From a paper:
All of these studies suggest that the inhibition of USP2 may be a good therapeutic approach against cancers. In the present study, 6-thioguanine (6TG), an old drug still clinically used to treat leukemia, rheumatoid arthritis and bowel disease, was identified as a potent USP2 inhibitor. Further studies using enzyme kinetics and X-ray crystallography to delineate its direct binding to USP2 were performed.
In an earlier study, the structure of wild-type USP2 in complex with Ub showed a misorientation of the thiol group of Cys276 due to electrostatic repulsion between the residue and the carboxyl group of Ub-Gly7623. To resolve this, in the present study, the crystal structure of the USP2 C276S mutant in complex with Ub was determined at 1.24 Å resolution. Indeed, the hydroxyl group of Ser276 shows a 140° orientation change compared with the thiol group of Cys276. This change results in the rescue of the hydrogen-bonding interaction between Ser276 and His557 and the reconnection of the catalytic triad even in the presence of Ub. Moreover, in the present structure, one oxygen atom of the carboxyl group of Ub-Gly76 is located in the oxyanion hole consisting of the three amides from Asn271, Thr275 and Ser276. Interestingly, but not surprisingly, the USP2 C276S mutant still maintains 10% deubiquitinating activity. Furthermore, in the presence of 40 μM 6TG, the DUB activity of the USP2 C276S mutant decreases to 30%, suggesting that 6TG can still inhibit the enzyme without the disulfide-bonding interaction. Compared with those of wild-type USP2, the residues interacting with 6TG, such as Leu269, Gln283 and Tyr558, have no conformational change in C276S mutant, indicating the existence of 6TG binding pocket.
Author numbering:
A (entry chain B): 1 to 76
B (entry chain A): 263 to 378, 385 to 599
The structure:
Amino acid sequence: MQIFVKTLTGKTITLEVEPSDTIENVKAKIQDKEGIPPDQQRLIFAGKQLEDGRTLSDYNIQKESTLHLVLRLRGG
Amino acid sequence: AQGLAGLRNLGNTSFMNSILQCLSNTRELRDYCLQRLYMRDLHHGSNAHTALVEEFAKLIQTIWTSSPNDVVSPSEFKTQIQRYAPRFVGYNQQDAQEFLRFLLDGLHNEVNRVTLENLDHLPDDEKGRQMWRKYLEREDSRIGDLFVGQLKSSLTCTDCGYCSTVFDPFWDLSLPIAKRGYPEVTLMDCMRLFTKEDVLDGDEKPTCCRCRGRKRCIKKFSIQRFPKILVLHLKRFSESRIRTSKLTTFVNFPLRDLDLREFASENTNHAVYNLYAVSNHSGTTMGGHYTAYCRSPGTGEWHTFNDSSVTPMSSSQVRTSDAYLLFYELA
Ligand SMILES: [Zn+2]
């Protein structure tokens, strides 16, 4: 199936995934297209940040859902 | 009962303090804590995270019973949030929006009122309403009452003309920043970047299942349901394939009368908002410091909350390029 990612500057990209794809798999697919390493990416869907070790199916993410890609401003 | 207590930095915890103060000044969330209304929503049984809601609420209670110049420790709260979200264990610098999302999800899960189909025949709005009902059958809490809205994503095949719609819940919106404005980038410009027509072609062609092949499609967001509290997160990070840098662009956001008519779904009633809190970041992507500017729900006066220091400020000092999260409430 296809899902979408709203990236950093205005664009959307299209990923080919299965419900069983891990969040790591999804981040790798984003890196394949965007050159942003998985360890910098955060993906938000339905108010939840998607976590490594879980799958798209764990979040009930269906076809044509959009993940929101956001980086970090670390502060202390 | 003025709510002007500072929060001790426990070791790189300004990100947490900034968020906590924004939440402290979220009127209805504060009131839920002060009126102890969470007690009846807590789940029965030995649960690992009931103490998260209890310690959050106790912190808010403490802030709103404090005297001038008081500084209180959120250490017991930190112990609980890091048990829910172990990425917050220890004393490293963190992103405030990441923290916000995990904290609100943890709170929501603990007071969730829930304890345990092809719709092509329906008009769009009715499909939206049914998908909303389905969402609320899983996620129904006081926390969601405040923060949750619904996006419509409309995906139109440029060949066959079929528009496939999906409805995604949201608890905040993360907005791309426009590259410049005339003479300045506005919050509305960023909202437009979020909600514009996105052309999906070349490498990004979706598969149209009507055409049974990859086709150029147009994707567009609109807001199907507006939240009571609208949290806007500015994407202050470059897309460099080598090294991200912080985008420090001034984004002009309004104090009052943020009118989102143009982003509402077609023939859907729209919302107008007023600002009540800002989380500010100063630094780089790798490190820095957070503060909050918050409007007191009772007095309407703005204060800067910077760890242990709480100081009055003019509304003219609220809009700055340091703004990272904007907290809006219905007008
Ligand atoms: Zn088609």
